[PDB]
Amino acid sequence: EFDAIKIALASPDMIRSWSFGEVKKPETINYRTFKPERDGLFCARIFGPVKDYECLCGKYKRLKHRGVICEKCGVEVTQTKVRRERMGHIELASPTAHIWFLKSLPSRIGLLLDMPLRDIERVLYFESYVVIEGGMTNLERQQILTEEQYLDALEEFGDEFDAKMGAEAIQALLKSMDLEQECEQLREELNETNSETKRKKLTKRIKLLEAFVQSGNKPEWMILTVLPVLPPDLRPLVPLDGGRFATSDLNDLYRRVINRNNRLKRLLDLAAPDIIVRNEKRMLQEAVDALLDNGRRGRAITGSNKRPLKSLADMIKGKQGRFRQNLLGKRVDYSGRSVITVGPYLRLHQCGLPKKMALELFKPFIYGKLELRGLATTIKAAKKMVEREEAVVWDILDEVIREHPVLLNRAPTLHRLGIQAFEPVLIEGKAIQLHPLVCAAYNADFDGDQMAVHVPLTLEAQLEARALMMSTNNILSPANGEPIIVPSQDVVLGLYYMTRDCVNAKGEGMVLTGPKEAERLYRSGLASLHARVKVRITEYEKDANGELVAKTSLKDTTVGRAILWMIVPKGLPYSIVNQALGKKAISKMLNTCYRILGLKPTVIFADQIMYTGFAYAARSGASVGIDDMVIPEKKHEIISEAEAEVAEIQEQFQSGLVTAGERYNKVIDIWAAANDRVSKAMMDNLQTETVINRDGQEEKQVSFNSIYMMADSGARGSAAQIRQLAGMRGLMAKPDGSIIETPITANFREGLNVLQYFISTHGARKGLADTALKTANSGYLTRRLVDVAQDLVVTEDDCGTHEGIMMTPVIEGGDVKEPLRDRVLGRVTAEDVLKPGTADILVPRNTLLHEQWCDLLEENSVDAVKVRSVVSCDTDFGVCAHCYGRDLARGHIINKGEAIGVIAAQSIGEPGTQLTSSIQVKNKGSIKLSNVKSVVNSSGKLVITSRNTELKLIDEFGRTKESYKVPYGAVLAKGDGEQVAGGETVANWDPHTMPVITEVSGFVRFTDMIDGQTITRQTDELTGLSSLVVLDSAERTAGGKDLRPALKIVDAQGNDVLIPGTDMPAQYFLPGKAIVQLEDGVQISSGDTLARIPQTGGLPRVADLFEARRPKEPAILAEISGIVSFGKETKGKRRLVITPVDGSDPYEEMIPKWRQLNVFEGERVERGDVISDGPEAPHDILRLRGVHAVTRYIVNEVQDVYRLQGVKINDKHIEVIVRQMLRKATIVNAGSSDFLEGEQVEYSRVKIANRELEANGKVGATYSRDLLGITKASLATESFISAASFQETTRVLTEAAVAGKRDELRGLKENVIVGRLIPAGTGYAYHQDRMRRRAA
Amino acid sequence: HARSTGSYSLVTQQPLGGKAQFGGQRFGEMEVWALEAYGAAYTLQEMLTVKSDDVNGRTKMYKNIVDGNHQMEPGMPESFNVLLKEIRSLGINIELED
Amino acid sequence: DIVLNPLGVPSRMNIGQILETHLGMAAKGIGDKINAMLKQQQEVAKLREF
Amino acid sequence: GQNMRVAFMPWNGYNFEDSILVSERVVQEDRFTTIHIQELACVSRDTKL
Amino acid sequence: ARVTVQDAVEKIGNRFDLVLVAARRARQMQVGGKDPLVPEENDKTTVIALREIEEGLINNQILDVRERQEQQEQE
Amino acid sequence: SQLKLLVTRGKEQGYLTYAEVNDHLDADDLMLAENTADEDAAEAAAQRTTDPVRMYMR
Ligand SMILES: [Mg+2]
Ligand SMILES: [Zn+2]
Ligand SMILES: [Zn+2]
């Protein structure tokens, strides 16, 4: 209807235009007749009649004569709702400053006038005068003149002198101000001499003057002359039961403003002393300030209840304002709630709805049906029929409900599966029956939880619920590809018990004809559910283009597996059910069914699995008793032995042989070992049993114990819970985080005594508090993540880009913890996947890698692919479907319009509550060295001559399996190009002192070495050797301080030995605190040690890693490639200069001397190398290394937090957030564009700006990408309606008003506030068509 | 607790709250995010306007339903009109450009 | 009268309910024996002895 | 409360997460039947008309 | 009926355009006044529209062509 | 000067206590506290009683 919203400042003429009349009296209503007063806050003349079509007096009280203004009253005869739309105005006697434009942090008034805020405040409060265009009389504009100074200046000046006080002075200043001429003057200033901040401040001044000139506002509009009055019905005075009333706080504030204004107007007629009028004007300013914003400049005015009054500003901001409490979430019609029960008889797509709730929610539909079918004549008859609950009413209700989805929702909606659409089934009672398989999606248990039910109304809403939100459409998690409809705890136990063989059961050794005979035998009592038999099984294979060829063969199975085979669909093999079928086997089975067959067979299969599991779990009759918790028979011996060892340690400490800090650890280790022994003994005794037999001999088998069965199948429990039940409760902690030495040696089968229970309580209280805190934090993280990345939408099919990420498996030193299949499945290749033999292309390009392609890649053993990624997408304002991948919840390539930002935010935030030397090879392969320079030492072996050496174990198949990091100068047993066996330590080194080593051998002379200037005399008394320890710069004398210890290599012939392969002299400038051991003239072998130089986690790690915080001590990277050099020393921090090979060297950094540098001044380093060592910074990687390196550092550094806790989410969702982090570009060269040199612009704008410009006959502009946090990157929103929702409302509206900003609703958070279709999903087509017609 | 239609609040024309007042269910921001994760634009629109505080759109929806026609004319909510009037009651001039 | 799920006991390590169930079974067994002796009209001597 | 005869076994998914399966003779014998008393007031006032 | 919607999506191609087309056809068949192209087993107009889309008897192009022909007839 | 030290401490720690701000510093105190929170910049760093009754008394 409008398609855009504009905001600006209001002129007094505009304010008089809005109003329908002036409010002159502070009266509200008569205390006797309760009628609106005349010219008061509630006035019928100004704001409209109080009841529909009726004058106040009553002479005109019918619709027939509407639109007429009664002469007696003046009240127009119209609808009363018009009182909700009409404003008034109050003409202030004297101008008042607007608090938003005075006490804002930038202080718009002061910024525009170029005056300190304190000067403005003191002139406002009638403290000192101000000269306004004084003239040529030796006065300076905007000069403070206190009362005495003003008085003595007035003398000797017959001129007016133009001095004023109060807000009138400010208004005169603003009105006299000229913006174009001052902008010209500032341009002249910027043209001339420039200083560090002079140029910046002048540029800011000119830019903001230009902005204010272009906004269309005028400065003097910041000073109020007329005050608008809100319509009465938004600040109502409403009668409550009895003689009492309730009123809004705005009535009090308006009454105060009007009282003081009228008093001032009266006072200005009496010609009162200036003291009185000054005080009155100060009070008027204070009252208007309190009205517009109460509690911002001074003390908040309070009411009778002694609480601060709510002002106009308080009604907009906060979590209880119109922007948040009512515009983004509000109460809804056609809704209900109730407690949820099980209902295990249901199908996956339907729920159970009480008849009473269904009758109440669908009332209009039932009225329509009753009238249509002729049962009722009018709607009143239908109402009475439904109110009496006749017989026909229930048939009509059953007809209405037939195919009408209802949305069920549970209160903590953490992801999109917390709302799902089901088909109702009318039931008796008052509880909602919820299908078991969906509980995990809701995180719902049946111990008192409640659910809300909403009913879609429109045809479009019903179709969306049926096609998008149905429960049979969401069976895969959207965070990863895994199903979320897995059977949970009792289905698992039933299917485990059914498929679980026994050694010598009834009917063992039989040969059945198929599943039917197996079931017929079991059900008639002739065979046991686990009796090993031979069964003829017929299974189908898709060994063709979908043909399902059959194969019949005699399998060796049990009766349970043969029975369970009856429910498995055609395409699957028989080996899926031919096992014990724990918790994870069932999930694998469902995943296999989904990938091979499709969606419908999977849903049918899941329902059959649930039914069979429940039936046979009931059949088994599995229970829990006190004899199932078998305590080990050796527990007392183990505890006694631990007691003896700890007592011996204590008495040894009492003899002063060990420090307490070590005996504590010894006792802790003793008790840990004892606990491990007890747990091992318990589990050994509890997981096996002896049975007999086919012939009569003792034979072991896995136990049928009930606790063990529950833990082993994954139904419920673990080894820790069993350990506490039958082992020992373990080792408790303390409030300080310490671990109390003596553990709880009792389990729960045995009782705890009072002290052990006291310690347990210590633990439990902390557990509860930590749970609460985690739930608190994980919501804030999700809210920020949604705010930053809400408006991302797939808005293209292919951008055509040829770039992407390089996906390879993740290896933490030893084993691999994420194969290539997990990281590559479902993505789009950016380049041909050449065969590892380099023969031909294996996967051409732009091919969505589904399961078959992943299997092919695994078969050919490729370990590196190039996959298109979101962070390297060429689409402007959105993403393309090919650079994203596939949906992960539907299984196909993502659809256009899908909102991927909200999905990414929800997927990242949903699991938040859950989360809290020598090198030895391990496999028979071949050593491969990457990024290392080799050389042969004196011993003849190979020594590393590099800092970034990487060792890989390339097996006979050419696949990496072990990646290891080796420091500098390590002796290697083997090298590249030689096969090795297992268990061979191919590298070793000393992890102590310093790795400073030489490179050649020969006579060493102390060149440029003077005793008493750089070294100290410290002879090795123990060995008798003389060692020259190099002191520091401070201690040493200045005679040779600038000199450094250089040890040149020479021969016996008197010549000079230089670095082999080059003419560079071989000198080693050793640093301070270096212990020179070998004397001059003593030949050294290659690599000799010249000097023995001495020396978070959980959610907060993720939250501080999306905020791009800089660590405490960031490792210094190589800013530029070139020879490293040094400059002036000890100028607060050690100075280092890098000189490129040819390029200029304007780089110099004050590197602190505290950092232990790992590079010598004679060693060149390229950019991106580490100078110091420590945690890396996120900003430095982006600058030194491309975008693909900072994203790789993040998607791997936050995925480590989740992997530890077992949470798995796709990498798609972390690259969506990163794409929104590095979104602003900083320009370095303007080029032929229209961009300022030092400016930050949206990277999308600059990318397209120079793109079209380059195509023409111009040259594009360079830039440097920038990285922000999710909280700083969400403040760059270009709409002031979405920004005010989650930012400071006062700041956003104050800056948008002066700038004359207008925003066209283009986001998801703005069309919700306005109340129109979002541009993301089903509303994507509507918005595109609107833009097309609008362009025309 | 179940509700089809009932009494509405005074200053903001939204359904009252609580079972005693025969109130509605609060549809918060997380549920809006959930409906945005699906492409359920029409469900979201009808929950934001017709079902909550679109004063003249909800009676039209009721009449359409009791007439065997499930179609809505969405309109503009009341909370946004109140917000415009409150922002305008300050010195700001916020309008709806066509 | 009531059927409860055993899978609730292992994870929530509150095995006091199983001991309560065993002891309540024992107590009701003693009560049923007294009731049987009382219905059969047995003299107070055997009732007192039991 | 009341002393109920209880058995620990699954029984067909009607005690799935924390649900309870109750006999119909626990309802015939009115063992968990409770009496609730509530007050309703009707105040008549003197209105303007 | 229609426990799943997966064939209709394949016919139309997009999950959202499917919803829009089905809603248009259902509104034609509910208030406008039209006869279904398939037998109705007490199905609501939304489900009948979905199954028509599934069988290939309805899509956006078909609806546009039919509306053009109808407007020609009315003229 | 005095404000500069408090600002340096707040930047180093990212947060400050009432005692530290009050020492290093009614309406003037509240105004100073509000100004300090501005940074959590240039204008606040560079930056009588404001009570209408105290000025009247003066
Ligand atoms: Mg619960
Ligand atoms: Zn009149
Ligand atoms: Zn792209």
The residue of chain D with its CA nearest to that of A342 is D14
Tokens of A673: 């070992």
List beta partners, residue A541.
A549
Question: Which of A460, A339, A334 has the alpha carbon at shortest distance from A406?
Answer: A334
- A6: exposed, middle or buried (Cβ count in 10 Å: 0-12, 13-18, 19+): middle
Integer Cα distance of A1250 and A1262 in angstroms: 9
Q: Which residue of A has its CA nearest to E3?
A: A349
Which residue stretches of A655-730 are H helix?
A: 660-686, 706-712, 719-726
Distance of CA A877 from the midpoint of ligand 3 (Å): 11
**Which residues contact residue A296 at a Cβ distance below 8 angstroms, ignoring those fewer than 6 apart?**
A99, A103, A289, A313
Q: How open is the CA angle A482-A487-A489, to the nearest 5 degrees?
A: 125
- Rounded Cα distance, D38 and A195, in Å: 82
Distances A55 to A42, A238, A646 between C-alpha atoms, Å: 15, 20, 97
Residue E41 and residue A1001: Cα distance in Å, rounded? Answer: 97
What is d(CA D42, CA A251) in angstroms, rounded to the nearest whole number?
33
Q: Which domain holds residue E35?
A: 1-75
- Give the residue from A250, A257, A258 showing the smallest Cα distance to A230: A250
DSSP 8-state assignment for residue A847: -
Kindly report the CA angle at A967 between A963 and A969, in degrees rounded to 5?
125
Pairing of strands B25-27, A144-146: unpaired
**C-alpha distances in Å from residue A715, one per residue of A320, A434, A1208, C6, C18:** 45, 20, 21, 11, 20
State whether residue A7 is helix, strand or coil: strand
Residue among A463, A1328, B44 nearest E19 (CA): A463
Contact A314, B90 (CB under 8 A): no
User: DSSP letter string over A61-85?
Assistant: -SSSS-S-B-TTT--B-S-GGGGGT
Q: Do C6 and D21 touch (CB under 8 A)?
A: no
Task: Quote the strand ranges of A1080-1195, DSSP E.
Answer: 1123-1126, 1134-1139, 1148-1151
Residues A220-250 as b or e (16 or more Cβ within 10 Å = b):
bbbbbbbbbbbbbbbbbbeeeeeeeeeebbb
CB count in 10 Å sphere of residue A1011: 11
**Could you say which residues from 453 to 492 on chain A have a Cβ atom under 8 Å away from some Cβ of chain C?**
489-490
Task: Tell me the nearest-neighbour CA distance from A1216 into chain B, angstroms.
Answer: 15
**Distance, CA of A724 to CA of A730 (rounded, Å):** 7
Q: Supply A165's token pair.
A: 């006080």
State how far the Cα of A543 lies from the Cα of A56, in Å rounded to an integer.
Answer: 88
Cite the beta strand spans of A1043-1095 per DSSP E.
1046-1050, 1056-1057, 1074-1076
Å between B29 CA and nearest CA of chain A? 6
Which chains reach chain F with 3 or more Cβ–Cβ distances below 8 angstroms? A
Instruction: Give φ, ψ of A371 to 5 degrees.
Output: -65, -40
The distance of Cα A214 from the centroid of its chain, to the nearest Å, equals 38
Q: Is residue A1211 a contact partner of residue A1228, using CB atoms and an 8 Å limit? A: no
DSSP-assigned beta bridge partners for residue A534: A511, A556
Strands A19-22 and A87-97: parallel
Partner residue facing A436 (CB), from D7, D16, D48? D16
Nearest alpha-carbon partner for A1223 in A1195, A1243, A1245: A1243
- CB-CB neighbours of A1034 under 10 Å: 8
- Contact flag for F and E (3+ C-beta pairs < 8 Å): no
**Whole-number Å distance between alpha carbons of A996 and A1073:** 13
Angle, helix A754-788 to helix A900-909, in steps of 10 degrees:
170
> How far, in Å, CA of A393 to CA of A369, rounded?
10
Which of A2, A224, A786 has its CB closest to that of B96? A2
- Convert chain D into a string of H (helix), E (strand) and C (coil): CCCCCEEECCCCCCCCCCCCEECCHHHHCCCCCCCCCCCCCCCCCCCCC
- Residues B4-19: b if buried by 16+ CB within 10 A, e if exposed: bbeebbeebbbbbeee
Helix axes A1099-1106, A754-788, angle to 10 degrees: 20
Q: What single DSSP character describes residue B15? A: B
Among candidates A1294, A1278, A1242, A1282, which has minimal Cα distance to A1263?
A: A1242
Whether B66 has its CB under 8 Å from any CB of chain A: the answer is yes
Flag if F52 and A106 touch (Cβ within 8 Å).
no
Chain D contact set for C18 (CB, 8 A): 8
Q: Do A463 and E17 touch (CB under 8 A)?
A: no
E31 in reach of chain B (CB within 8 A):
yes
Cβ-Cβ contacts under 8 Å, E19 against chain B = 39
**Count of domains observed in chain E:** 1
**Residue in A119, A117, A122 with CA at minimum distance from that of residue A107:** A117
Q: Where are the beta strands (DSSP E) in A1141-1215?
A: 1148-1151
Q: Give how far Cα A816 sits from Cα of A960, A962, A963, E42, Å.
A: 9, 8, 9, 57
Structure tokens of A462?
């019903």
Q: How far apart are CA A278 and CA F58, in angstroms?
A: 13
| B83 contacts on A by Cβ (under 8 Å) | 316, 322-323, 327
Contact D19 A624 (CB under 8 A): no
In angstroms, the Cα distances linking A634 to A641, A966, A1074 are 11, 47, 59
Strand partners, A227: A90
D20, C4 contact by CB (below 8 A): yes
Task: Print the SS3 string covering A191-237.
Answer: HCCCCCCHHHHHHHHHHHHHHHHHHCCCHHHHEEEEEEECCHHHCCE
| Amino acid at the residue A100 | W
DSSP string, A405-439: -EEEE-SS--SGGGEEEEEEEEESSSSEE--GGGH
| Chain D residues touching residue C14 (CB < 8 angstroms) | none
Contact criterion met (CB < 8 Å) for A446 and D14: no
Contact A1033, A1014 (CB under 8 A): no
A447 Cα: distance to centroid of ligand 1 (angstroms): 5
Experimental method: cryo-EM
C-beta separation of A433 from A346 below 8 A? yes
What's the rounded Cα separation, in Å, for the pair E49 and E57? 10
Decide the pairing of beta strands A335-341 and A432-433: parallel
Contact list, A468 vs chain E (CB under 8 Å):
15, 19
Residue A511's SS3 state is strand
Residue F27 region, left (φ>0) first, then alpha (ψ -120 to 50), else beta?
alpha
- Whether the bond into A693 is cis, omega within 30 of 0: yes
Q: Match 């408790």 to its residue by tokens.
A: A732
Alpha-carbon distances of A67 from A55, A75, A495, rounded to whole Å:
11, 10, 78
Query: For residue E29, which amino acid is it?
Result: M
What separation in angstroms does the CA of A1216 have from each of A792, A879, A1021, A1191? 8, 10, 65, 10
Q: Which of A398, A409, A401 is nearest to A454 (CA)?
A: A409
Nearest CA in chain D to C27: D3
Question: What is the rounded CA–CA span in Å between residue E50 and residue E21?
Answer: 9
CB C10 within 8 A of CB A717: yes
The C-alpha of E52 sits at a distance from chain A's nearest C-alpha, in angstroms, of: 14
CB contacts < 8 A, A to B, total 298
| Distance from C-alpha of A159 to C-alpha of A131, rounded to nearest angstrom | 13
Give every CB contact of residue A555 below 8 A, 6+ residues apart in sequence.
A534, A535, A536, A537, A574, A578
Edge-to-edge strands, sheet with A960-965: A926-930, A950-954, A960-965
The one-letter amino acid at A457 = L
CA A928, chain centre distance (Å): 39
**Ligand 1: centre distance to CA A446 (Å):** 6
Q: Are A48 and A67 in contact (CB under 8 A)?
A: no
Chains F and B are in contact, defined as 3 or more C-beta pairs closer than 8 angstroms = no
Q: How far apart, in whole angstroms, are the C-alpha atoms of residue B14 and residue A1286?
A: 23
DSSP state of A871: G
State how far residue A611 is from chain D, nearest Cα, in angstroms. 9
**What span, in angstroms and rounded, lies between the C-alpha atoms of A961 and A949?**
17
- Per DSSP, the residues of A989-1055 read ---SS-----S--BEEEEET--TTTSEEEEE-TTT--EEEEE--TTTS-TTSTT---EEEEE-TTS-
Rounded distance from Cα A64 to ligand 2 centre (Å)? 16
Nearest to A1226 by CA among A1275, A1193, A1264, A1254: A1264
From the CB of residue A658, how many other CB atoms can be counted at a distance below 10 Å? Answer: 16
| Contact list, B31 vs chain A (CB under 8 Å) | 329, 409, 413, 418-419
Give residue C16's identity as a one-letter amino acid code.
Answer: G
- φ, ψ at A986 (rounded to 5°): -80, -5
| Pair of tokens at residue A964 | 């290891």
* β-pairing verdict for A1224-1229 and A1262-1266: antiparallel
Residues A585, A593: Cα–Cα separation, whole Å: 12
- Contact: A459, E16; criterion CB under 8 Å: no
With CA atoms as reference, the chain A residue closest to E26 would be: A459
Q: Which residues of A are annotated as a binding site for Zn(2+)?
A: 55, 57, 70, 73, 799, 873, 880, 883
3-state DSSP helix/strand/coil percent for chain F, to nearest 5?
70, 0, 30
C-proximal residues of D, 1-49, CB under 8 Å: 3-11, 14-16, 18-23, 25-26
Cβ <8 Å between A490 and C11: no
Q: How far is D14 from chain C (nearest CA, A)?
A: 9
Q: What is the dihedral of CA C41, C45, C50, D2, to 10 degrees?
A: 50
Beta carbons of A870 and A1219 less than 8 angstroms apart: yes
Nearest to A664 by CA among A729, A734, A727, A724: A734
Query: Contact A118/A145 with Cβ under 8 angstroms?
Result: no
Going from the Cα of A47 to the center of ligand 2, the distance in angstroms, rounded, reads 14
Contacts of A464 in chain E (CB under 8 A): 19
User: How many CA atoms lie within 13 Å of A991's alpha carbon, on the beta-carbon side?
Assistant: 6
What does residue A1296 show for φ and ψ, rounded to 5 degrees? -70, -30
Sequence-separated contacts (24+) of F30-39 with Cβ below 8 Å: F30/A299, F36/F3, F36/F6, F36/F7, F36/F10, F38/A105, F39/F7, F39/F10, F39/F11
DSSP string, A261-282: HHHHHHHTTTT--HHHHHHHHH
Kind and range of the H or E run holding A562: helix A559-564
User: Any idea what DSSP says for residue E29?
Assistant: I
D in contact with E (at least 3 C-beta pairs within 8 A): no
Binding-site residues of A, in ranges, read: 55, 57, 70, 73, 445, 447, 449, 799, 873, 880, 883
* SS3 per-residue string spanning B52-92: CCCHHHHHHHHHHHCCCCCCCCCCCCHHHHHHHHHHHHCCE
- Chain B residue with Cα closest to A2: B98
The tokens of E60 are what? 């956006």
Phi, psi of A1003 (to 5 degrees): -65, 140
Q: Exposed e or buried b for every residue in A525-535, given b needs 16+ CB within 10 A?
A: eebbbbbbbeb
Partner residue opposite B71 with nearest CB, options E16, E19, E27: E27
Nearest to A480 by CA among A1212, A1206, A1321: A1212
User: Which tokens is A270 given?
Assistant: 């009496």
CA nearest neighbour of A439 among A370, A511, A489, A392: A489
| Alpha carbon of E72: minimum distance to chain A alpha carbons (Å) | 25
Sheet with A918-919, strands from edge to edge, namely A918-919, A987-988, A971-972, A942-944, A934-936
What is the token pair recorded at A657?
A: 């042989």
Quickly list DSSP for A1154-1169: TS---S-TTS-B-TT-
Cα–Cα distance for residue pair A426/A353, rounded to 1 Å:
5
Query: Are residues A162 and A132 in contact, defined by beta-carbon separation less than 8 angstroms?
Result: yes
Q: Say yes or no for a CB contact (<8 Å) between A895 and E15.
A: yes
- Interface size A-D, in CB pairs within 8 Å, comes to 54
Residue to substitute from A342, A716, A728, A744, interface C, most C β-carbons within 10 A: A716
Which residue, among A150, A142, A146, has the nearest Cα to A115 in the 3D structure?
A142
Distance CA B28, CA A1047 (A): 75
- CB-nearest to C6 from A624, A748, A749 is A624
- The Cα A787–Cα E23 span in angstroms is 32
- For A102, A455, A459, A561, B16, the CA distances from A462, given in Å and listed in that order, are 52, 9, 5, 42, 26
Listed by start position, the domains of chain B span 14-98
Q: What angle do CA A1298, A1299, A1303 make, to 5 degrees?
A: 120
Give me the residue label for tokens 């004899």.
A627
Token representation of residue A1145: 């060297």
CA distance A1015 to A107: 62
Distance CA A451, CA A1242 (A): 44
Assess contact for A229 and A23: CB atoms under 8 A.
yes
Q: Residue A87: exposed, middle, or buried by beta-carbon count in 10 A (0-12, 13-18, 19+)?
A: buried
Does B39 sit within 8 Å of E30, measured CB to CB? Answer: no
Q: For residue A165, what are the CA distances in angstroms to A65, A134, A160, A161, A218?
A: 54, 14, 14, 13, 21
The CATH number of residue E43's host domain is 3.90.940.10
Task: For A363-394, give the DSSP string.
Answer: HHHHHHHHHHTTS-SSHHHHHHHHHHT-HHHH
